[PDB]
Structure 1
Amino acid sequence: PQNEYIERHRKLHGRRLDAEERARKKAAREGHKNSENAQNLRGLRAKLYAKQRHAQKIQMRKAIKQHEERNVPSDPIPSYLLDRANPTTAARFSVPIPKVRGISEEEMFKVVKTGKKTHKKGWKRIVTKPTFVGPDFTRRPVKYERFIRPMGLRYKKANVTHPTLNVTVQLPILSVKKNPSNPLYTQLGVLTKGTIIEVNVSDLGIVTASGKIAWGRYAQITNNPENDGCVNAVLLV
């Protein structure tokens, strides 16, 4: 068969003789079936069913309210900026997150054991949090490497949000300025929550009052990168 052959078979022969009556009776039994599903499903299937029915009820209420109310940009922009996807756009020099959970050295570092004996040497410490190592990085030789910052935990970019512009851009990390838990964590370059980092802001296009281009600014990390797999930061503007 070719093209719309089921529709052509419908046109030439119809359906089964009881199709309309069976469809009407099933649509009539739908209410009892839905109540039975609400009262008799179990577990994760019942939880997903309840969430999905909650969604349908909210949507139906919105549609009914809109039909009830049937009988009744924000910032000024130039004409060439009309009909475009524009952002909503929403002394004490305090940062947005002035206090975070402190990280103990036991949580920060884990002991790496060395040696072939049953009793092992334990002077090496591995950093368990994400780090930034900077440019032109070459690792220390293994005999003199106390702090291990593993390769798979090293980051170079961050999703940085500008509070005024309501714009999030991925920016390169320039340095790590202050980890609030420890100056040693600052020196190791640990990226945890509340850490002040320096970011390349060339993409944001920031011009100073004297006409110079600002390409380095400070941002505070606002998430838990070891849990999230990424670095989220907010510019300090």
Structure 2
Amino acid sequence: PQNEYIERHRKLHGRRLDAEERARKKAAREGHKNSENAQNLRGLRAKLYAKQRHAQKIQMRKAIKQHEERNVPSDPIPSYLLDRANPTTAARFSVPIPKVRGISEEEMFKVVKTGKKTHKKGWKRIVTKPTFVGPDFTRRPVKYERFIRPMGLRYKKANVTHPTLNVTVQLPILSVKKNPSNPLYTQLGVLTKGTIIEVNVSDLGIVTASGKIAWGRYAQITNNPENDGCVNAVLLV
């Protein structure tokens, strides 16, 4: 068969003789069936069903409110900026996150054991949080590498939000300025929550009052990269 052959069959021969009445009876039984599903389903299936019914009820109430209310930009932009997708756009020199949870050194460092005996030497420590190692990085040789910063936990870029411009751009990390828990953590370059980092803001188009281009600024990490797998930062402007 070719093209709309089922539609052609419906035109030529119709449907089954009980199809209309059985569809009407099933649509009439939908109310009892939905109540039975609400009172009898179990587990994750029941939870998903209840959530999706909650969504349907919210959408239906919105539609009814709109049908009741049938009988009744923000920032000034030029003509060439009209009809485009524009952002909504919403002394004490305090950072947005002045205090975070402190990290102990046993949480930061785990002991790496070495040796072939049953008793092991335990002088090596491994950093368990994401770090920034900076450019031109070569690891110390293994005989003198006390602190291990694994390559899988190294980050070079972060999602930085400008609070005023209401934009989020992925920017390269320039340096780690201050880890709030320990200067040793700052020296190792650990990227945790509340950390002040230096970011490249060339893509944000910031121009100083004298006409120079500001390509390096400060951001604060607002997330937990060890839990999220990404670094989220807010510019300190």
TM class, shorter-length: over 0.9
In 2, the alpha carbon distance for the partners of 1:193 and 1:130 equals: 11
Q: Structure 2 CA distance, aligned partners of 1:130 and 1:106?
A: 16
**Deviation of residue 27 (structure 1)?**
0.1
1:53-132 alignment runs, 5 A limit:
53-132=53-132
Q: Deviations over 1:89-120 (max 9, x none)?
A: 00000000000000000000000000000000
Superposed displacement of residue 42, structure 1: 0.2
Structure 1 residue 60: Cα displacement: 0.1
Q: Post-superposition shift, 1:162?
A: 0.1
Report Cα offsets for 1:197-223 as digits up to 9, x if no partner: 000000000000000000000000000
Aligned residues: 237
Distance 1:13 1:95 in 2: 75
Give how far 1:64 is off: 0.1
Distance 1:42 1:62 in 2: 29
2: CA distance, partners of 1:15 / 1:185: 75
Shift of 1:9: 0.1
Which residue does the alignment assign to 1:193? 193
Q: Tell me how far 1:172 sits from its aligned partner.
A: 0.1
Deviation at 1:163, TM superposition (A): 0.1
1:194, distance to aligned residue in structure 2 (A): 0.1
- Counterpart Cα distance in 1 of 2:161 and 2:97: 14
Deviations 1:139-195 (A, max 9, x none): 000000000000000000000000000000000000000000000000000000000
TM-score for both structures, normalised by structure 1: 1.00
Q: Report the identity percentage.
A: 100
How many Å apart are 1:24 and its aligned residue?
0.1
Gaps of 5+ in 1: none
**How far apart in 2 are the matches of 1:29 and 1:133?**
65
C-alpha separation between the residues in 1 aligned to 2:165 and 2:20?
A: 58
In 2, the alpha carbon distance for the partners of 1:55 and 1:101 equals 37
Instruction: Tell me how far apart the structure 2 counterparts of residues 186 and 137 of structure 1 sit (CA, whole Å).
Output: 16
Q: CA deviation at 1:19?
A: 0.2
After superposing on structure 2, the runs of 4+ consecutive aligned residues of structure 1 that deviate more than 6 Å are none
